[PDB]
Ligand binder design. Structure first.
Ligand code: CA
Ligand code: CA
Ligand code: CA
Lengths: 10, 281
């Protein structure tokens, strides 16, 4: 049930 | 009020105008769910999906960053990406021999799979799992990490979503990764297992039948609290199963280690060890 997101940032 | 113009520039035949617009859009989408909604509302999705067919790697990379950032939004914002038709073109990029493109396609897919069960099932239905499972054999640690994120996300769903991961043959590779000397990769493999084992008893028993318990029980002796925690979360999830599952945990020698961990100085460790030990009576 553990979710994770990754952003793409400069 | 500049957004509509940026979205029109995504069609410009001047690659400088196009790229300027694309870089601005991707970064506005990184700024929270309201900014994501502004990008969606300005009509960016169809243009961004079209750009997943570009043979221009500079355009494709930034397009992928924009889609990844939109997919860091709420579940219905993720669903907008799926509804704009992104997934086949995105999944197809898992065949790329270009590591930058592969890495960026995996992030995007992993974010989509961080949505709710409708969003996860769409990723499954698009055919991603065999590729993701094969990337568990990658000798590229960056790619391997990302495949483990995507798979962990997929396995964060309900039992049907979990079972699709199991049916794609992920478990033998995940269990092999438990012997990695790479502490980063080990923890990601434990996360994937600890999501799979949060399913029902049939999913838990698949984790057991693939031979996870001896390795998890060994990891209860790790001096690295990050690893230990992740192994404890996995084993505790397994112990939440039925009596057959509990018995397998006991037969593997977990009780004696858990009793030792009850007094651990790390409070998160101590609490999960106590909870695990109680599940097993
Ligand atoms: Ca041109
Ligand atoms: Ca290459
Ligand atoms: Ca190491």
């Amino acid at each position: 049930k553990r979710k994770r997101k990754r952003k793409r940032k400069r | 009020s500049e957004l509509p113009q940026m979205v029109q520039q995504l069609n410009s035949p001047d690659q400088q105008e196009l790229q300027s617009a694309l870089r601005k859009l991707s970064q506005i989408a990184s700024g929270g769910n309201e900014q994501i909604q502004a990008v969606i509302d300005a009509g960016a999705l169809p243009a961004l999906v079209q750009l997943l067919s570009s043979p221009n790697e500079q355009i494709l990379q930034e397009a992928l960053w924009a889609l990844s950032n939109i997919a860091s939004g709420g579940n219905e914002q993720i669903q907008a990406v799926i509804d704009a038709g992104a997934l086949p073109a995105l999944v197809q990029l898992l065949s790329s021999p270009n590591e930058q493109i592969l890495q960026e396609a995996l992030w995007a897919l992993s974010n989509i799979a961080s949505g709710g069960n409708e969003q996860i099932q769409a990723v499954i239905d698009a055919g991603a799992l065999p590729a993701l499972v094969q990337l568990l054999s990658s000798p590229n640690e960056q790619i391997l990490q990302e495949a483990l994120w995507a798979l962990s996300n997929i396995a964060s769903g309900g039992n049907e979503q979990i079972q699709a991961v199991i049916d794609a043959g992920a478990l033998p590779a995940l269990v092999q990764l438990l012997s990695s000397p790479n502490e980063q990769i080990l923890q990601e493999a434990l996360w994937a297992l600890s999501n799979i084992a949060s399913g029902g008893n049939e999913q838990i028993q698949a984790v057991i039948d693939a031979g996870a318990l001896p390795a998890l029980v060994q990891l209860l002796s790790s001096p690295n609290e990050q690893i230990l925690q992740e192994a404890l979360w996995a084993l505790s999830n397994i112990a939440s199963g039925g009596n057959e599952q509990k018995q397998a945990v006991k037969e593997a020698g977990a009780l004696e280690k858990l009793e030792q961990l009850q007094s651990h100085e790390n409070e998160k460790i101590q609490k999960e060890a106590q909870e695990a030990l109680e599940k097993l009576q």
